[PDB]
């Protein structure tokens, strides 16, 4: 935006990353298998590296987690809620050396 | 002391004193009444200096004529305490001598010269021993 | 510029020299 | 205008061009000629100045032809 001028605009600059996110739930009829599955999900989300996310909406992608939650309510004995946000595992150098 | 001009203002006086410590001058008036010769020298431009003492080694004396060129060496970089170490008179200097010589002189001949092969020439007009 | 202005203004107490 | 105003380019900097290198078919002909000549030189060198000369000359031929093809004809966004 210029001073004392009306016609303005914007200039393009690349494209920001695709920040995917989803909400998941772990529930059973045993209240112990549910806890075991929730623990497995915790320890698999909190792992070093990038893993094959499979989602009915996203598809098959390779992402690295950024955050997650595990909410229960002390009244629902089987329910465990999760909310995850993931970023694509795009690892490319800046200088991009050539010959 | 962030700006270029601010740094210049901060650093100028030291360089001014450095550049003004040593100086040349001309001699206009010589006063010999004092125990040390008092010259009246003329510095760079529109600058005089009265009562500037001259220093000469022990055992030698000479009274230069007006117009000689002196080397004023200011003590402690003050433009005061100016002391004249040498006063050369290029208009009346003996020239074209042998490689090894040494002798006194006067501004019209009068050379007590010591020459290469053991010759103590004394060229004067009326020598008077006492 | 607290010191940068004290140079442009006078200083009856000399900084250097 | 002074020389500080103008930005120098690589050609002038290395200078401190034969017309054959202007068009496309002439570039193709020149590359083919250089390749054939250097290949013949390598084959002949394989009998006098046996090994080191040939091993160096083959890599020189590869580098020269690669430079010419990658910079003269294989330009970015060339269509027919």
């Amino acid at each position: 935006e210029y001073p004392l001028r009306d016609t303005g605009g914007v200039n393009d600059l690349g494209k920001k990353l695709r920040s995917r996110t989803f909400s998941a739930c772990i529930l059973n009829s045993n209240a112990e298998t549910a806890r075991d599955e929730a623990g497995a999900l915790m320890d698999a989300l909190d792992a070093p590296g990038s893993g094959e996310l499979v989602h009915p909406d996203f598809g098959t992608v390779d992402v690295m987690v950024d955050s997650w939650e595990c909410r229960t309510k002390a009244d629902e004995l089987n329910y465990y809620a999760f909310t995850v946000t993931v970023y694509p595992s795009l690892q490319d150098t800046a200088p991009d050396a050539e010959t | 002391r962030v700006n270029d001009s601010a740094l210049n203002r901060l650093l100028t006086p030291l360089m001014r004193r450095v550049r003004l410590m040593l100086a040349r001058a001309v001699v206009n008036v010589i006063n010999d009444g004092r125990k040390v010769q008092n010259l009246q020298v003329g510095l760079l431009d529109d600058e005089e200096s009265d009562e500037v003492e001259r220093l000469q080694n022990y055992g030698h004396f000479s009274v230069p004529l007006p117009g000689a060129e002196a080397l004023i060496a200011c003590v402690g970089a003050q433009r005061d305490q100016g002391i004249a170490v040498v006063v050369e008179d290029r208009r009346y200097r003996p020239t074209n001598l042998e490689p090894g010589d040494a002798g006194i002189y006067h501004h019209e001949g009068h050379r007590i010269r010591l020459t290469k092969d053991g010759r103590c020439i004394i060229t004067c007009k009326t020598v008077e021993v006492y | 510029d607290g010191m940068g202005l004290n140079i442009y203004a006078g200083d009856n107490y000399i900084t250097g020299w | 205008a002074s020389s500080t105003s103008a930005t120098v380019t690589q050609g002038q900097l290395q200078l401190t061009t034969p017309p054959v290198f202007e068009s496309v078919s002439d570039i193709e002909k020149t590359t083919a000629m250089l390749g054939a000549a250097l290949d013949s030189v390598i084959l002949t060198a394989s009998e006098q100045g046996f090994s080191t000369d040939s091993v160096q000359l083959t890599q020189l031929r590869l580098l020269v032809v690669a430079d010419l093809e990658k910079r003269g004809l294989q330009l970015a966004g060339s269509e027919s």
Partner: protein, 366 residues
């Protein structure tokens, strides 16, 4: 209480932000104002080189020439300012011009009046001392030396401090004597700052230099006493060894050496202890403006401070929007701005001089 800038031709009253500075540790008092006008209007009354007179209310604070004027405009803001100093600041950056670089037997006031003649600055001498008026046996001017440099060099040897008046004159100021105002922590203080650092104050300042032998004294002075000169001034606030040796600035005698040694000791005392306060009103308690060289009584006893009297050293007036009306007043001990003759509180001559020193408004016999 409007800040009117009498420029060349007409008055200018309204301002967006005002900042004025005054001090006795400087030879000028600078001001900076902010002006806001529609883009395209003619701003020629505020130009570099114009003759300005700042007038707070009905009283003049600064007078001199305008220095700078900044104008900037971005996509969402617009700022125009203007600056300036006194007419005494004309000497700071101007080279001293005189015909004969040497003054044989002159006093500091006469040297200053001969040096500040071509510009227009009027010299004012306030000290009534008998030793501060002692003539220089000889004073030469280094070529390409500014008037400020020359006069500061002379005033340092004399012990006097040089300042700029509120009307543009040069002043060889005298410290105040009567306690006029009171600053307490409970009533009229918004913010205080008491710094007490001992990284520079020493115990014994001793100055060494060369005697006088140019001409008339050259027939009298011997060889050893030409080089052997000394002066001492001892401080009682530092209990360790902590000495300091000072190479003199010019030709020196014993009394001159003692004077410089104190000059240095008192300047270190003034620079060591510093008080700072932010009061609410530009005006004083009586009603006049706040200016340097005023003896105030400090009663910051709720903060366990044991200082009782101080002397103002710097006053800066502010009119920012976020600030309102403020004036940051800085304070230093009085004993740091005195001449070596006087002291902070052997014959008939000594008694009479004492009497006429305790009573300055009386006329000395001279």
């Amino acid at each position: 209480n409007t800040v009117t800038l009498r420029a060349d031709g007409r008055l200018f009253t309204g301002w967006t932000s005002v900042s004025v500075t005054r001090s006795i540790e400087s030879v000028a008092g600078y001001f900076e104002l902010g002006v806001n006008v529609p883009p395209g209007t003619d701003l020629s009354g505020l130009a570099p080189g114009k003759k300005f007179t700042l007038e707070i209310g009905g009283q003049i604070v600064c007078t001199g020439y305008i220095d700078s004027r900044r104008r900037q405009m971005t996509a969402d803001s617009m700022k125009i300012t203007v600056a300036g100093r006194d007419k005494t600041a004309d000497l700071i950056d101007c080279a001293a011009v005189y015909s004969g670089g040497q003054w044989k037997n002159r006093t500091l006031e006469q040297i200053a009046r001969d040096l500040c003649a071509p510009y227009g600055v009027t010299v004012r001498w306030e000290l009534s001392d008998k030793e501060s008026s002692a003539a220089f046996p000889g004073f030469t001017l280094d070529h390409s030396e500014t008037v400020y440099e020359a006069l500061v060099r002379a005033s340092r040897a004399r012990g006097v401090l040089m300042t700029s008046n509120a009307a543009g004159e040069l002043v060889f100021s005298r410290a105040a004597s009567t306690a006029t105002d009171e600053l307490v922590l409970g009533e009229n203080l918004l913010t205080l700052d008491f710094e007490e650092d001992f990284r520079d104050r020493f115990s014994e300042y001793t100055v060494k230099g060369y005697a006088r032998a140019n001409g008339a004294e050259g027939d009298d002075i011997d060889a050893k006493s030409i080089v052997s000169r000394k002066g001492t001034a001892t401080d009682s606030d530092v209990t360790r060894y902590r000495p300091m040796i000072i190479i003199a600035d010019s030709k020196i005698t014993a009394k001159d050496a003692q004077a410089r040694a104190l000059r240095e000791q008192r300047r270190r005392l003034a620079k060591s202890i510093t008080f700072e306060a932010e009061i609410d009103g530009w005006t004083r308690k009586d009603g006049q403006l706040w200016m340097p060289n005023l003896l105030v009584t400090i009663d910051a006893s709720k903060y366990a401070i044991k200082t009782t009297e101080l002397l103002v050293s710097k006053v800066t007036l502010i009119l920012n929007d976020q600030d309102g009306l403020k004036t940051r007043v800085s304070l230093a001990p009085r004993e740091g701005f005195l001449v070596p003759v006087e002291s902070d509180r052997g014959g008939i001559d000594a008694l009479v001089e004492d009497y006429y020193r305790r009573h300055p408004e009386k006329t000395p016999p001279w």
